[PDB]
Amino acid sequence: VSLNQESVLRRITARIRQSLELEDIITATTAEVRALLGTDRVMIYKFHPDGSGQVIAESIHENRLPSLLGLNFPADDIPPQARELLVKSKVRSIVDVATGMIGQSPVHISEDICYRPVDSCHVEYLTAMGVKSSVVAPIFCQDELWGLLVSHHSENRTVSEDELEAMQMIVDQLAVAIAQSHLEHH
Amino acid sequence: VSLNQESVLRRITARIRQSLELEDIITATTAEVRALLGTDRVMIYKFHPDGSGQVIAESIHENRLPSLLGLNFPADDIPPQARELLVKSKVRSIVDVATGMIGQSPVHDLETGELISEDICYRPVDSCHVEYLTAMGVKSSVVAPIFCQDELWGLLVSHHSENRTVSEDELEAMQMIVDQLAVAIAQSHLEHH
Amino acid sequence: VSLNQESVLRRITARIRQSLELEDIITATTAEVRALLGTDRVMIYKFHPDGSGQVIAESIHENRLPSLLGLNFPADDIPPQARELLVKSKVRSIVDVATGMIGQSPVHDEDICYRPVDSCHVEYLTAMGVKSSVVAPIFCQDELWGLLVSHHSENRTVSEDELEAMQMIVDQLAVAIAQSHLEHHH
Numbered sequence: 001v002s003l004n005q006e007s008v009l010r011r012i013t014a015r016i017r018q019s020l021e022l023e024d025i026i027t028a029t030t031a032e033v034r035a036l037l038g039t040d041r042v043m044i045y046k047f048h049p050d051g052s053g054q055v056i057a058e059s060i061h062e063n064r065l066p067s068l069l070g071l072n073f074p075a076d077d078i079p080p081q082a083r084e085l086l087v088k089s090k091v092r093s094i095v096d097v098a099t100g101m102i103g104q105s106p107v108h109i110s111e112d113i114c115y116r117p118v119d120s121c122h123v124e125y126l127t128a129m130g131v132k133s134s135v136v137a138p139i140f141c142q143d144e145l146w147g148l149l150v151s152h153h154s155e156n157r158t159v160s161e162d163e164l165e166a167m168q169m170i171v172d173q174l175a176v177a178i179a180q181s182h183l184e185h186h
Numbered sequence: 187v188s189l190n191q192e193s194v195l196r197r198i199t200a201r202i203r204q205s206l207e208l209e210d211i212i213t214a215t216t217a218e219v220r221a222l223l224g225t226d227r228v229m230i231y232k233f234h235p236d237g238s239g240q241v242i243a244e245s246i247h248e249n250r251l252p253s254l255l256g257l258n259f260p261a262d263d264i265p266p267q268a269r270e271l272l273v274k275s276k277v278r279s280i281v282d283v284a285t286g287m288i289g290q291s292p293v294h295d296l297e298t299g300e301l302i303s304e305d306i307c308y309r310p311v312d313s314c315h316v317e318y319l320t321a322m323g324v325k326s327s328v329v330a331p332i333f334c335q336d337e338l339w340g341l342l343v344s345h346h347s348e349n350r351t352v353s354e355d356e357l358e359a360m361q362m363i364v365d366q367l368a369v370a371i372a373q374s375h376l377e378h379h
Numbered sequence: 380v381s382l383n384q385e386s387v388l389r390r391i392t393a394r395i396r397q398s399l400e401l402e403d404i405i406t407a408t409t410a411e412v413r414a415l416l417g418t419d420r421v422m423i424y425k426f427h428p429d430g431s432g433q434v435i436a437e438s439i440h441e442n443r444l445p446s447l448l449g450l451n452f453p454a455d456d457i458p459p460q461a462r463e464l465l466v467k468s469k470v471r472s473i474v475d476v477a478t479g480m481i482g483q484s485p486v487h488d489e490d491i492c493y494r495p496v497d498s499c500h501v502e503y504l505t506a507m508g509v510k511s512s513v514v515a516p517i518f519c520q521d522e523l524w525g526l527l528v529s530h531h532s533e534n535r536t537v538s539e540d541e542l543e544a545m546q547m548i549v550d551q552l553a554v555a556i557a558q559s560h561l562e563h564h565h
């Protein structure tokens with residue numbers, strides 16, 4: 001009756017089984033992730049080869065944040081240090097604007113969230129978008145960084161380990177969808 | 187603080203040995219605890235079966251904050267996530283209003299797995315709880331749960347009107363105090379079967 | 380092309396080979412350390428027997444912070460709890476004024492854990508015009524000898540790499556002090 005991570009994954013798995021078009025899998029899954037997390041805006045961001053990227057799916061609750069679907073953002077928005085954490089540690093990151101802190105959890109039992117001061121450039125970036133809470137988990141295809149699952153909220157909120165676990169399961173299942181689609185299409 | 191925490195424990199034990207009514211043991215103890223911690227308001231909060239609760243003992247320094255003795259608070263003040271941390275991890279919590287952070291230290295932690303004693307880890311605290319404390323004029327809150335056998339029985343609550351830092355040693359003191367109260371409570375239950 | 384920790388240590392080692400007076404090694408070193416770390420003010424603080432201390436060397440970028448060279452500070456500026464962390468854990472400390480947090484990293488034999496910093500210390504730093512402080516202890520054999528202090532007038536983030544550089548520098552200074560004691564032995 002209520003949405004859980006298990007039922008969201010079961011539907012992604014069925015979509016893969018039916019060989020639905022990958023872009024449609026990504027679009028439909030993004031909407032369920034937003035419903036599951038309850039946040040104002042959930043996006044899937046896909047990297048280009050030069051490290052810039054594009055918002056390729058987006059689900060927004062009640063027009064509470066602007067639509068970024070289709071927009072491109074430069075490589076420099078994610079500096080080398082942050083990018084390295086994504087690639088090598090598969091870090092999940094929670095930004096809390098009100099406290100000026102970022103909480104990071106590698107995948108590598110190292111799944112206790114450790115909070116530290118976040119760079120003011122990134123705080124200012126989020127504030128300009130009207131975002132008070134950001135949660136990001138990277139998406140891989142095989143061993144390569146493919147994109148990001150991004151959750152934005154217009155108000156302060158707390159983020160639990162269970163929520164990061166749900167996001168991690170979802171990006172792991174999307175990785176399977178992406179790899180299977182590549183295999184099916186040559 | 188350590189020569190003092192030991193004396194607080196001894197004084198509780200003396201009351202148990204003299205066969206004081208549990209309510210009197212609890213009342214007399216909060217004043218000695220406040221003196222030890224030095225904070226403006228120390229309370230013992232007792233849970234009702236429905237998860238609401240009541241302030242059943244209180245000691246305040248120089249009327250610095252209003253008295254909450256006898257007041258009831260609804261279950262909703264402690265939502266399920268928070269309550270589960272209390273029940274399953276026996277978490278001790280330090281709220282620092284100025285930074286908007288809450289520090290939590292389990293005594294023993296993870297679900298149906300090995301439970302391990304930790305260091306204090308700080309994270310952003312929910313704005314509702316910050317607003318709740320700020321409405322009372324509280325800048326620092328420290329809470330340790332009281333158990334009777336496996337049941338969450340109550341809380342030892344320490345409020346202060348000014349910013350402060352809280353050390354491991356202070357949490358350790360609070361932990362010994364709630365462990366000693368738990369003994370008084372268990373003995374009383376056995377005597378009133 | 381740029382300064383790294385390895386070349387900074389090689390020059391400290393060369394100064395040791397010249398049997399320069401310890402104060403002169405330390406004076407000659409602080410400027411390169413500031414250029415390496417990039418902060419507004421780097422100081423070496425030497426403890427007196429009663430726990431008070433003196434700024435015995437200092438390098439400042441473009442007068443961005445006042446000069447504290449030669450000034451003495453009382454023992455109580457560093458309370459027993461803080462002093463014990465220095466002595467027993469060789470703790471490195473990062474204070475972030477904007478968030479009101481202090482991050483501490485032991486040397487041990489884990490990462491940086493942030494907690495609220497005492498408001499007395501916040502006020503101490505603010506009164507100096509400091510928004511970022513990073514401190515690592517200096518030892519001689521097993522005795523706490525002084526501090527390497529890095530101050531900045533603007534908020535910033537501090538990485539593990541910066542702590543590693545500071546740790547290499549205070550370890551090399553410990554060698555300079557020990558060698559100096561042996562060479563000046565009666």
Ligand SMILES: *[C@H](C)[C@H]1/C(=C/C2=NC(=C\c3[nH]c(C[C@H]4NC(=O)C(C=C)=C4C)c(C)c3CCC(=O)O)/C(CCC(=O)O)=C2C)NC(=O)[C@@H]1C
Nearest residue numbers: 073076077078079082093095102118119121122125134136
């Ligand atoms: C300053 C002049 C730079 C800049 C600096 C930084 N960005 C940092 C982290 C970061 N940025 C993103 C952007 C990504 N998040 C979004 O919401 C969107 C747009 C929809 C994008 C493209 C991400 C994912 C990250 C990683 C952290 C996170 O997951 O939130 C960063 C590190 C901050 C820290 O860890 O302390 C810095 C210094 N960003 C700018 O835009 C300008 C060019």
Ligand SMILES: *[C@H](C)[C@H]1/C(=C/C2=NC(=C\c3[nH]c(C[C@H]4NC(=O)C(C=C)=C4C)c(C)c3CCC(=O)O)/C(CCC(=O)O)=C2C)NC(=O)[C@@H]1C
Nearest residue numbers: 259262263264265268279281288311312314315318327329
């Ligand atoms: C929001 C609309 C809710 C609400 C939400 C939360 N309360 C949280 C934690 C919490 N609350 C108490 C209350 C307890 N402390 C006191 O001082 C008193 C009264 C004297 C009482 C009854 C406690 C003990 C706790 C646990 C945290 C702690 O030990 O301080 C909470 C979680 C915060 C977090 O951990 O991030 C939330 C979201 N509280 C409300 O009053 C309204 C109805």
Ligand SMILES: *[C@H](C)[C@H]1/C(=C/C2=NC(=C\c3[nH]c(C[C@H]4NC(=O)C(C=C)=C4C)c(C)c3CCC(=O)O)/C(CCC(=O)O)=C2C)NC(=O)[C@@H]1C
Nearest residue numbers: 452455456457458461472474495496497499500503514528
């Ligand atoms: C309050 C009435 C006291 C007082 C209290 C505290 N000082 C704390 C830590 C601390 N202080 C220093 C001083 C040292 N840093 C400098 O920049 C200089 C001078 C240029 C000096 C002499 C250090 C090194 C430390 C350790 C932490 C750090 O490395 O930054 C402290 C603990 C803070 C905390 O950990 O929460 C307290 C409570 N300081 C005062 O000046 C007055 C007398």
